[PDB]
Each structure stands twice: as C-alpha cells, then as structure tokens.
Amino acid sequence: KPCQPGRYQNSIGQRVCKPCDMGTYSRYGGELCTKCPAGTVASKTGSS
Amino acid sequence: GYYTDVDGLPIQLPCKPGTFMPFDTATANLLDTGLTVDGTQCYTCQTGT
C-alpha cells in the first residue's frame, strides 16, 4: 500500500511509513518528504 | 494482543483477526522455534487454528 499523505518511506521492504518532519509535506505515496515551497507553510509533523 | 509498529503511536493498535500477540515468547503456546515477540509484530495463527 502507498504511504498516505503526511508520511514517506525511502527504503525497500519496510513495513512502516515514517512521518514527515516539520515544514515539509507529502502526498499519497512519495519516496521522500517534499520541502514546502516559498510562500507556503507546514505547521505540524506529517502535514498532508 | 496489542502492538506499536512505529514509534510515537498515541495508542497501542489491536491485532487484526487472524493474528495474535502473545504476552511473551516463553508463554507463547503456539509459536514456531525461530519466532520471538517484542510488541511490534503481529503473528498469524497457525494452520489448524
């Protein structure tokens, strides 16, 4: 299953999705958290 | 019967039907030789159970 938004998983064979850090966001799936672009803000950990 | 696969889970999630989480490896009644329990692993029921 893909890691639902707010999480990420940069590995193979992992059974869990790590949560995104503060100031970063991720959508469904995603191999890595995306740094939030200029002019936008991520407030909490695992921001969708 | 409960597990926390990832760190920081607010509550211990219950094991889904078909699996189980024994109190300890020593008291695990039906577990294979090489399997150990630590609280982050849900083990499926054996064949016949």
Side-chain angles (χ1 to χ4, degrees):
Chain A
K1 348 182 197 177
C3 293
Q4 49 197 90
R7 334 292 203 290
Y8 72 104
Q9 182 39 261
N10 59 326
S11 266
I12 35 163
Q14 291 333 285
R15 50 184 194 100
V16 281
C17 301
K18 292 125 73 80
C20 292
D21 294 309
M22 198 104 57
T24 53
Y25 86 109
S26 146
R27 300 308 268 110
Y28 272 97
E31 74 108 20
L32 249 172
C33 55
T34 296
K35 302 258 172 214
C36 176
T40 61
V41 54
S43 304
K44 342 184 302 312
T45 73
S47 324
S48 85
Chain B
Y2 300 92
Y3 73 104
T4 44
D5 38 23
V6 77
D7 35 5
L9 278 186
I11 196 167
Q12 56 226 58
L13 320 169
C15 293
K16 73 175 295 277
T19 69
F20 78 105
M21 245 282 308
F23 170 83
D24 200 312
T25 84
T27 185
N29 23 36
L30 276 203
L31 220 67
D32 262 331
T33 69
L35 308 190
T36 56
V37 300
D38 52 349
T40 110
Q41 192 108 333
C42 329
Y43 287 92
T44 72
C45 286
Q46 286 208 1
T47 38
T49 89

Coordinates of all heavy atoms in Angstrom, one line a residue:
Chain A
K1 N 0.8 -1.2 0.0 CA 0.0 0.0 0.0 C 0.9 1.3 0.0 O 1.9 1.3 0.6 CB -0.9 0.0 1.2 CG -1.0 -1.3 2.0 CD -2.0 -1.1 3.2 CE -1.8 -2.3 4.2 NZ -2.7 -2.1 5.4
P2 N 0.4 2.3 -0.7 CA 1.2 3.5 -0.7 C 1.1 4.3 0.7 O 0.1 4.2 1.4 CB 0.6 4.4 -1.8 CG -0.8 3.9 -1.8 CD -0.8 2.5 -1.4
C3 N 2.2 4.9 1.0 CA 2.2 5.7 2.3 C 1.2 6.9 2.1 O 1.4 7.8 1.2 CB 3.6 6.2 2.6 SG 4.8 4.9 3.1
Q4 N 0.2 7.0 2.9 CA -0.8 8.0 2.8 C -0.2 9.4 3.2 O 0.8 9.4 3.8 CB -2.0 7.7 3.7 CG -1.6 7.3 5.2 CD -2.7 6.6 5.9 OE1 -2.8 5.4 5.9 NE2 -3.6 7.4 6.6
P5 N -0.8 10.5 2.7 CA -0.2 11.8 2.8 C 0.2 12.1 4.2 O -0.5 11.8 5.2 CB -1.2 12.7 2.2 CG -2.5 12.0 2.4 CD -2.2 10.6 2.1
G6 N 1.3 12.8 4.4 CA 1.9 13.1 5.7 C 3.1 12.2 6.0 O 3.9 12.5 6.9
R7 N 3.2 11.0 5.4 CA 4.3 10.1 5.6 C 5.1 9.9 4.4 O 4.9 10.4 3.3 CB 3.7 8.7 6.1 CG 2.3 8.8 6.7 CD 2.4 9.5 8.1 NE 1.2 9.1 8.9 CZ 0.0 9.5 8.7 NH1 -0.4 10.2 7.7 NH2 -0.9 9.1 9.6
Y8 N 6.2 9.1 4.6 CA 7.1 8.8 3.5 C 7.9 7.5 3.9 O 7.9 7.1 5.0 CB 8.1 10.0 3.2 CG 9.1 10.2 4.3 CD1 10.4 9.7 4.0 CD2 8.8 10.8 5.5 CE1 11.4 9.9 5.0 CE2 9.8 10.9 6.4 CZ 11.1 10.5 6.2 OH 12.1 10.7 7.2
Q9 N 8.5 6.9 2.9 CA 9.3 5.7 3.1 C 10.4 5.6 2.0 O 10.1 5.2 0.9 CB 8.4 4.5 3.1 CG 9.1 3.2 3.3 CD 10.2 3.4 4.4 OE1 11.4 3.5 4.1 NE2 9.8 3.3 5.7
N10 N 11.6 6.0 2.4 CA 12.7 6.0 1.5 C 13.6 4.7 1.7 O 14.7 4.8 2.0 CB 13.6 7.2 1.6 CG 14.1 7.4 3.0 OD1 13.5 7.0 4.0 ND2 15.3 8.0 3.1
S11 N 12.9 3.6 1.4 CA 13.6 2.3 1.5 C 12.8 1.2 0.8 O 11.7 1.5 0.3 CB 13.9 1.9 3.0 OG 15.2 2.3 3.4
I12 N 13.3 0.0 0.8 CA 12.7 -1.2 0.2 C 12.5 -2.2 1.3 O 13.4 -2.5 2.1 CB 13.5 -1.7 -0.9 CG1 15.0 -1.6 -0.7 CG2 13.1 -1.0 -2.2 CD1 15.8 -2.5 -1.5
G13 N 11.2 -2.7 1.4 CA 10.9 -3.8 2.3 C 10.5 -3.3 3.7 O 10.2 -4.2 4.5
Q14 N 10.4 -2.0 3.9 CA 9.9 -1.5 5.2 C 8.4 -1.8 5.3 O 7.7 -1.7 4.4 CB 10.2 0.0 5.3 CG 11.7 0.3 5.4 CD 12.5 -0.8 6.1 OE1 12.4 -1.0 7.3 NE2 13.2 -1.5 5.3
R15 N 8.0 -2.1 6.6 CA 6.6 -2.3 6.9 C 5.9 -1.1 7.5 O 4.8 -1.3 8.0 CB 6.5 -3.6 7.8 CG 7.4 -3.5 9.0 CD 7.3 -4.8 9.8 NE 7.9 -4.6 11.1 CZ 7.2 -4.4 12.2 NH1 5.9 -4.4 12.2 NH2 7.9 -4.3 13.4
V16 N 6.6 0.0 7.6 CA 6.0 1.2 8.2 C 6.4 2.4 7.3 O 7.4 2.4 6.6 CB 6.5 1.4 9.6 CG1 5.7 0.5 10.6 CG2 8.0 1.1 9.8
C17 N 5.6 3.5 7.5 CA 5.9 4.8 6.8 C 6.3 5.8 7.9 O 5.6 6.0 8.9 CB 4.7 5.3 6.1 SG 4.0 4.2 4.8
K18 N 7.5 6.4 7.7 CA 8.0 7.4 8.6 C 7.2 8.7 8.4 O 6.8 9.0 7.3 CB 9.5 7.6 8.5 CG 10.3 6.4 8.9 CD 11.3 6.0 7.8 CE 12.4 7.0 7.6 NZ 13.5 6.8 8.6
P19 N 7.0 9.4 9.5 CA 6.2 10.7 9.3 C 7.1 11.8 8.9 O 8.3 11.9 9.2 CB 5.7 11.0 10.7 CG 6.8 10.4 11.6 CD 7.3 9.2 10.9
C20 N 6.6 12.7 8.1 CA 7.3 13.9 7.6 C 7.7 14.8 8.7 O 7.0 14.9 9.7 CB 6.5 14.6 6.5 SG 6.2 13.7 5.0
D21 N 8.8 15.5 8.5 CA 9.3 16.5 9.5 C 8.5 17.8 9.4 O 7.7 18.0 8.5 CB 10.8 16.7 9.3 CG 11.6 15.5 9.6 OD1 11.4 14.8 10.6 OD2 12.4 15.1 8.7
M22 N 8.8 18.6 10.4 CA 8.1 19.9 10.4 C 8.6 20.8 9.3 O 9.8 20.8 8.9 CB 8.5 20.7 11.8 CG 7.6 21.8 12.1 SD 6.4 21.4 13.4 CE 7.5 20.9 14.7
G23 N 7.7 21.5 8.6 CA 8.0 22.3 7.5 C 8.0 21.6 6.2 O 8.3 22.2 5.1
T24 N 7.6 20.3 6.1 CA 7.6 19.5 4.9 C 6.3 18.8 4.8 O 5.6 18.6 5.7 CB 8.7 18.5 4.9 OG1 8.7 17.7 6.1 CG2 10.1 19.1 4.8
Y25 N 5.9 18.5 3.5 CA 4.6 17.9 3.2 C 4.8 16.8 2.2 O 5.8 16.8 1.4 CB 3.6 19.0 2.7 CG 3.7 19.2 1.2 CD1 2.7 18.8 0.4 CD2 4.8 19.9 0.7 CE1 2.7 19.0 -1.0 CE2 4.8 20.1 -0.7 CZ 3.8 19.7 -1.5 OH 3.9 19.9 -2.9
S26 N 3.9 15.9 2.2 CA 3.9 14.8 1.2 C 2.5 14.4 0.9 O 1.6 14.4 1.7 CB 4.7 13.6 1.8 OG 4.1 12.4 1.3
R27 N 2.3 13.9 -0.3 CA 1.0 13.4 -0.8 C 1.0 11.9 -0.8 O 2.0 11.2 -0.3 CB 0.7 13.9 -2.2 CG 0.6 15.5 -2.2 CD -0.4 16.0 -1.1 NE -1.8 16.1 -1.6 CZ -2.8 15.3 -1.3 NH1 -2.6 14.3 -0.4 NH2 -4.0 15.5 -1.8
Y28 N 0.0 11.2 -1.4 CA -0.1 9.8 -1.4 C 1.2 9.2 -2.1 O 1.7 9.7 -3.0 CB -1.3 9.3 -2.2 CG -2.5 9.2 -1.3 CD1 -3.5 10.3 -1.2 CD2 -2.8 8.1 -0.5 CE1 -4.6 10.2 -0.4 CE2 -3.9 8.0 0.3 CZ -4.8 9.0 0.3 OH -5.9 8.9 1.1
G29 N 1.7 8.1 -1.5 CA 2.9 7.5 -1.9 C 4.1 8.4 -1.6 O 4.1 9.0 -0.5
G30 N 5.0 8.6 -2.5 CA 6.1 9.5 -2.3 C 7.3 8.9 -1.6 O 7.2 8.4 -0.5
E31 N 8.4 8.9 -2.3 CA 9.6 8.3 -1.8 C 10.3 9.2 -0.7 O 11.2 8.7 0.0 CB 10.6 8.0 -2.9 CG 11.3 9.2 -3.5 CD 12.8 9.3 -3.1 OE1 13.3 8.2 -2.7 OE2 13.4 10.4 -3.2
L32 N 10.0 10.5 -0.7 CA 10.7 11.4 0.3 C 9.8 12.6 0.5 O 9.0 13.0 -0.3 CB 12.0 11.8 -0.3 CG 13.3 11.3 0.5 CD1 14.5 11.7 -0.3 CD2 13.3 11.9 1.9
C33 N 9.9 13.2 1.7 CA 9.2 14.4 2.0 C 9.6 15.6 1.1 O 10.8 15.7 0.9 CB 9.3 14.7 3.5 SG 11.0 14.9 4.0
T34 N 8.7 16.4 0.7 CA 8.9 17.5 -0.2 C 9.1 18.8 0.7 O 8.2 19.1 1.5 CB 7.8 17.7 -1.2 OG1 7.8 16.5 -2.1 CG2 8.1 18.9 -2.0
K35 N 10.2 19.5 0.5 CA 10.3 20.7 1.2 C 9.3 21.7 0.7 O 9.1 21.9 -0.5 CB 11.7 21.3 1.0 CG 12.9 20.4 1.4 CD 13.5 20.8 2.8 CE 14.4 19.8 3.3 NZ 14.4 19.7 4.8
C36 N 8.6 22.3 1.7 CA 7.4 23.2 1.3 C 7.9 24.4 0.6 O 8.9 25.1 1.0 CB 6.7 23.6 2.6 SG 5.3 24.7 2.3
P37 N 7.3 24.8 -0.6 CA 7.9 25.9 -1.4 C 7.8 27.2 -0.7 O 7.2 27.4 0.3 CB 7.1 25.8 -2.7 CG 5.8 25.2 -2.2 CD 6.1 24.2 -1.2
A38 N 8.3 28.3 -1.4 CA 8.3 29.6 -0.8 C 6.9 30.1 -0.8 O 6.1 29.9 -1.7 CB 9.2 30.5 -1.7
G39 N 6.6 30.9 0.3 CA 5.3 31.5 0.5 C 4.2 30.5 1.1 O 3.1 31.0 1.3
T40 N 4.6 29.3 1.4 CA 3.6 28.3 2.0 C 4.3 27.8 3.2 O 5.5 27.7 3.4 CB 3.3 27.2 1.0 OG1 4.5 26.5 0.6 CG2 2.7 27.8 -0.3
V41 N 3.4 27.3 4.1 CA 3.8 26.9 5.5 C 3.2 25.6 5.8 O 2.1 25.3 5.6 CB 3.4 28.0 6.5 CG1 1.9 28.3 6.4 CG2 3.8 27.6 7.9
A42 N 4.1 24.7 6.4 CA 3.6 23.5 7.0 C 3.8 23.6 8.5 O 4.8 23.9 9.0 CB 4.4 22.3 6.5
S43 N 2.7 23.4 9.3 CA 2.6 23.8 10.7 C 3.0 22.6 11.6 O 3.7 22.9 12.6 CB 1.2 24.3 11.0 OG 0.8 25.3 10.2
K44 N 2.6 21.4 11.3 CA 2.8 20.3 12.2 C 3.6 19.2 11.4 O 3.7 19.2 10.2 CB 1.5 19.7 12.7 CG 0.3 20.7 12.6 CD -0.9 20.2 13.3 CE -1.3 18.8 12.7 NZ -1.3 18.9 11.2
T45 N 4.0 18.2 12.2 CA 4.6 17.0 11.6 C 3.6 16.2 10.9 O 2.5 16.1 11.3 CB 5.3 16.1 12.7 OG1 4.2 15.5 13.5 CG2 6.1 17.0 13.7
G46 N 4.1 15.6 9.8 CA 3.2 14.8 8.9 C 2.1 15.7 8.3 O 0.9 15.2 8.2
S47 N 2.4 16.8 7.8 CA 1.4 17.7 7.1 C 1.1 17.1 5.7 O 2.0 16.9 4.9 CB 1.9 19.1 7.0 OG 2.7 19.5 8.1
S48 N -0.2 16.9 5.5 CA -0.7 16.4 4.2 C -0.3 17.4 3.1 O 0.1 17.0 2.0 CB -2.2 16.1 4.2 OG -2.9 17.3 3.9
Chain B
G1 N -1.7 -8.9 22.8 CA -2.7 -8.6 21.8 C -2.6 -7.3 21.1 O -3.3 -7.0 20.1
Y2 N -1.7 -6.4 21.6 CA -1.6 -5.1 21.0 C -0.1 -4.8 20.6 O 0.8 -5.5 21.0 CB -2.0 -4.0 22.0 CG -3.4 -4.1 22.5 CD1 -3.7 -4.8 23.6 CD2 -4.4 -3.5 21.8 CE1 -5.0 -4.9 24.0 CE2 -5.7 -3.6 22.2 CZ -6.0 -4.3 23.3 OH -7.3 -4.4 23.7
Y3 N 0.1 -3.9 19.7 CA 1.4 -3.6 19.1 C 1.5 -2.1 18.7 O 0.5 -1.4 18.6 CB 1.6 -4.5 17.9 CG 0.8 -4.0 16.7 CD1 1.4 -3.4 15.6 CD2 -0.6 -4.3 16.6 CE1 0.7 -3.0 14.5 CE2 -1.3 -3.9 15.5 CZ -0.7 -3.2 14.4 OH -1.4 -2.8 13.3
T4 N 2.8 -1.7 18.6 CA 3.1 -0.4 18.2 C 4.3 -0.5 17.2 O 5.4 -0.5 17.6 CB 3.5 0.5 19.3 OG1 4.3 -0.2 20.2 CG2 2.2 1.0 20.1
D5 N 3.9 -0.6 15.9 CA 4.9 -0.8 14.9 C 5.9 0.3 14.8 O 7.1 0.1 14.6 CB 4.3 -1.1 13.5 CG 3.1 -0.3 13.3 OD1 3.0 0.8 13.9 OD2 2.2 -0.7 12.5
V6 N 5.4 1.5 14.8 CA 6.3 2.7 14.6 C 6.3 3.5 16.0 O 5.3 3.5 16.7 CB 5.8 3.6 13.5 CG1 4.6 4.4 13.9 CG2 6.9 4.5 13.0
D7 N 7.4 4.2 16.2 CA 7.5 5.0 17.4 C 6.6 6.2 17.4 O 6.3 6.8 16.4 CB 8.9 5.5 17.6 CG 9.6 5.8 16.3 OD1 8.9 5.8 15.3 OD2 10.8 6.1 16.3
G8 N 6.1 6.5 18.6 CA 5.2 7.7 18.8 C 3.7 7.4 18.5 O 3.0 8.4 18.4
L9 N 3.3 6.2 18.5 CA 1.9 5.9 18.3 C 1.1 6.3 19.5 O 1.4 6.0 20.6 CB 1.7 4.5 18.0 CG 1.9 4.0 16.5 CD1 1.5 2.6 16.3 CD2 1.2 4.9 15.6
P10 N 0.0 7.1 19.3 CA -0.8 7.6 20.5 C -1.3 6.4 21.4 O -1.4 6.6 22.6 CB -1.9 8.4 19.9 CG -2.1 7.9 18.5 CD -0.7 7.4 18.1
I11 N -1.8 5.4 20.7 CA -2.3 4.2 21.4 C -1.9 2.9 20.8 O -1.5 2.9 19.6 CB -3.9 4.3 21.5 CG1 -4.5 3.3 22.5 CG2 -4.4 3.9 20.1 CD1 -5.9 3.6 22.8
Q12 N -1.9 1.9 21.6 CA -1.5 0.6 21.0 C -2.6 0.0 20.1 O -3.7 -0.1 20.6 CB -1.1 -0.4 22.1 CG -2.2 -0.6 23.2 CD -1.7 -0.6 24.6 OE1 -1.1 0.4 25.0 NE2 -2.0 -1.6 25.3
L13 N -2.3 -0.2 18.9 CA -3.3 -0.8 18.0 C -3.5 -2.2 18.2 O -2.6 -3.0 18.6 CB -2.8 -0.6 16.5 CG -2.2 0.8 16.2 CD1 -1.5 0.8 14.9 CD2 -3.1 1.9 16.4
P14 N -4.8 -2.7 18.1 CA -5.1 -4.1 18.3 C -4.7 -4.9 17.1 O -4.6 -4.5 15.9 CB -6.6 -4.1 18.5 CG -7.0 -2.7 18.4 CD -6.0 -1.9 17.7
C15 N -4.4 -6.2 17.4 CA -4.0 -7.1 16.3 C -5.3 -7.5 15.5 O -6.3 -7.8 16.1 CB -3.4 -8.4 16.9 SG -1.8 -8.1 17.6
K16 N -5.1 -7.5 14.2 CA -6.3 -7.8 13.3 C -6.7 -9.3 13.5 O -5.9 -10.1 13.9 CB -5.9 -7.5 11.9 CG -4.9 -8.5 11.2 CD -4.7 -8.2 9.8 CE -6.0 -8.4 9.0 NZ -6.2 -9.9 8.6
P17 N -7.9 -9.6 13.1 CA -8.4 -11.0 13.2 C -7.5 -11.9 12.3 O -7.1 -11.5 11.2 CB -9.8 -11.0 12.7 CG -10.2 -9.6 13.0 CD -9.0 -8.7 12.8
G18 N -7.2 -13.1 12.8 CA -6.3 -14.0 12.2 C -4.9 -14.0 12.7 O -4.1 -14.9 12.5
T19 N -4.5 -12.9 13.4 CA -3.2 -12.8 14.1 C -3.4 -12.7 15.6 O -4.5 -12.6 16.1 CB -2.5 -11.5 13.5 OG1 -3.1 -10.3 14.0 CG2 -2.5 -11.5 12.0
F20 N -2.2 -12.7 16.3 CA -2.2 -12.6 17.7 C -0.9 -12.1 18.2 O 0.1 -12.3 17.5 CB -2.6 -14.0 18.4 CG -1.5 -15.0 18.4 CD1 -0.8 -15.2 19.6 CD2 -1.1 -15.6 17.2 CE1 0.3 -16.1 19.6 CE2 0.0 -16.5 17.3 CZ 0.6 -16.8 18.5
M21 N -0.9 -11.6 19.4 CA 0.3 -11.1 20.0 C 0.4 -11.7 21.5 O -0.3 -11.1 22.4 CB 0.3 -9.6 20.1 CG 1.4 -8.9 19.3 SD 3.0 -9.0 20.1 CE 2.6 -8.3 21.7
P22 N 1.2 -12.7 21.7 CA 1.3 -13.3 23.0 C 2.0 -12.4 24.0 O 2.7 -11.5 23.6 CB 2.0 -14.6 22.7 CG 2.9 -14.3 21.6 CD 2.1 -13.4 20.7
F23 N 1.8 -12.7 25.3 CA 2.5 -12.0 26.3 C 4.0 -12.0 26.2 O 4.7 -11.0 26.4 CB 2.0 -12.5 27.7 CG 2.8 -11.9 28.8 CD1 2.5 -10.7 29.4 CD2 3.8 -12.6 29.4 CE1 3.2 -10.2 30.4 CE2 4.5 -12.1 30.5 CZ 4.2 -10.9 31.0
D24 N 4.5 -13.2 25.9 CA 6.0 -13.4 25.8 C 6.3 -14.7 25.0 O 5.4 -15.5 24.8 CB 6.6 -13.5 27.2 CG 8.1 -13.2 27.2 OD1 8.8 -13.8 26.4 OD2 8.6 -12.4 28.0
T25 N 7.5 -14.8 24.6 CA 7.9 -16.0 23.8 C 7.8 -17.2 24.7 O 7.4 -18.3 24.2 CB 9.3 -15.8 23.3 OG1 10.3 -16.1 24.3 CG2 9.5 -14.3 22.8
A26 N 8.2 -17.1 26.0 CA 8.2 -18.2 26.9 C 6.8 -18.7 27.1 O 6.6 -19.9 27.1 CB 8.8 -17.8 28.2
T27 N 5.8 -17.8 27.2 CA 4.4 -18.2 27.4 C 3.6 -18.3 26.1 O 2.4 -18.5 26.2 CB 3.7 -17.2 28.4 OG1 2.4 -17.7 28.6 CG2 3.7 -15.9 27.7
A28 N 4.3 -18.1 25.0 CA 3.6 -18.3 23.7 C 3.3 -19.8 23.5 O 4.2 -20.6 23.3 CB 4.4 -17.7 22.6
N29 N 2.0 -20.2 23.5 CA 1.7 -21.6 23.4 C 1.9 -22.2 22.1 O 2.5 -23.3 21.9 CB 0.2 -21.8 23.8 CG -0.6 -20.5 23.6 OD1 -0.4 -19.8 22.7 ND2 -1.5 -20.2 24.5
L30 N 1.6 -21.5 21.0 CA 1.7 -22.0 19.6 C 2.5 -21.0 18.8 O 2.0 -20.1 18.2 CB 0.4 -22.2 19.0 CG -0.3 -23.6 19.3 CD1 -1.3 -23.9 18.2 CD2 0.8 -24.7 19.4
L31 N 3.9 -21.1 18.9 CA 4.8 -20.3 18.1 C 5.9 -21.1 17.6 O 6.4 -22.0 18.3 CB 5.3 -19.1 18.9 CG 5.4 -17.8 18.2 CD1 4.1 -17.2 17.9 CD2 6.2 -16.8 19.1
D32 N 6.4 -20.9 16.4 CA 7.5 -21.6 15.8 C 8.8 -21.3 16.6 O 8.8 -20.4 17.4 CB 7.7 -21.3 14.3 CG 7.0 -22.3 13.4 OD1 6.9 -23.5 13.8 OD2 6.6 -21.9 12.3
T33 N 9.8 -22.1 16.4 CA 11.0 -22.1 17.2 C 11.7 -20.7 17.0 O 12.2 -20.1 17.9 CB 11.9 -23.2 16.8 OG1 12.4 -23.0 15.5 CG2 11.2 -24.5 16.9
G34 N 11.8 -20.3 15.7 CA 12.6 -19.1 15.4 C 11.9 -17.8 15.6 O 12.5 -16.7 15.4
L35 N 10.7 -17.7 16.1 CA 9.9 -16.5 16.2 C 10.0 -16.0 17.6 O 9.8 -16.8 18.6 CB 8.5 -16.7 15.8 CG 8.2 -17.4 14.4 CD1 6.8 -17.3 14.1 CD2 9.1 -16.7 13.4
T36 N 10.2 -14.7 17.8 CA 10.2 -14.0 19.1 C 9.3 -12.8 19.0 O 9.1 -12.2 17.9 CB 11.6 -13.6 19.5 OG1 12.2 -12.7 18.4 CG2 12.5 -14.8 19.7
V37 N 8.7 -12.5 20.1 CA 7.8 -11.3 20.2 C 8.4 -10.2 21.0 O 9.1 -10.4 22.0 CB 6.5 -11.8 20.9 CG1 5.8 -12.9 20.0 CG2 6.7 -12.3 22.3
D38 N 8.2 -9.0 20.6 CA 8.7 -7.8 21.2 C 7.7 -6.7 21.4 O 8.0 -5.7 22.0 CB 9.9 -7.2 20.5 CG 9.6 -7.0 19.0 OD1 8.6 -7.5 18.5 OD2 10.4 -6.3 18.3
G39 N 6.5 -6.9 20.8 CA 5.4 -5.9 20.9 C 5.3 -5.0 19.7 O 4.5 -4.1 19.7
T40 N 6.0 -5.3 18.6 CA 5.9 -4.6 17.3 C 5.6 -5.6 16.2 O 5.7 -5.2 15.0 CB 7.2 -3.8 17.0 OG1 7.8 -4.4 15.9 CG2 8.1 -3.8 18.2
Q41 N 5.1 -6.8 16.5 CA 5.0 -7.8 15.5 C 3.7 -8.6 15.8 O 3.6 -9.1 16.9 CB 6.2 -8.7 15.4 CG 6.2 -9.6 14.2 CD 7.3 -9.3 13.2 OE1 7.7 -8.1 13.2 NE2 7.8 -10.2 12.5
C42 N 2.8 -8.7 14.8 CA 1.6 -9.5 14.9 C 1.8 -10.8 14.2 O 2.1 -10.7 13.0 CB 0.4 -8.7 14.4 SG 0.4 -6.9 14.6
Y43 N 1.6 -11.9 14.9 CA 1.9 -13.2 14.3 C 0.6 -13.9 13.9 O -0.3 -14.0 14.7 CB 2.7 -14.1 15.3 CG 4.1 -13.6 15.4 CD1 4.5 -12.7 16.4 CD2 5.1 -14.1 14.6 CE1 5.8 -12.3 16.6 CE2 6.4 -13.7 14.7 CZ 6.8 -12.8 15.7 OH 8.1 -12.4 15.9
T44 N 0.6 -14.4 12.7 CA -0.6 -15.1 12.2 C -0.9 -16.4 12.9 O 0.1 -17.0 13.4 CB -0.5 -15.3 10.7 OG1 0.5 -16.4 10.4 CG2 0.0 -14.1 9.9
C45 N -2.1 -16.8 12.9 CA -2.5 -18.0 13.6 C -1.9 -19.2 12.8 O -1.8 -19.2 11.6 CB -4.0 -18.1 13.7 SG -4.7 -17.1 15.0
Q46 N -1.6 -20.3 13.5 CA -1.1 -21.5 12.9 C -2.1 -22.2 12.1 O -3.3 -21.9 12.1 CB -0.5 -22.4 14.0 CG 0.8 -22.0 14.6 CD 1.6 -23.1 15.1 OE1 1.2 -24.3 14.9 NE2 2.7 -22.9 15.7
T47 N -1.7 -23.1 11.2 CA -2.6 -23.9 10.5 C -3.3 -24.9 11.4 O -2.7 -25.5 12.2 CB -1.9 -24.7 9.4 OG1 -0.6 -25.2 9.9 CG2 -1.6 -23.9 8.2
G48 N -4.7 -25.0 11.3 CA -5.5 -25.7 12.2 C -6.1 -24.9 13.3 O -7.0 -25.3 14.0
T49 N -5.6 -23.6 13.5 CA -6.1 -22.7 14.5 C -6.6 -21.5 13.7 O -6.4 -21.3 12.5 CB -5.1 -22.3 15.5 OG1 -4.4 -21.2 15.0 CG2 -4.1 -23.4 15.8

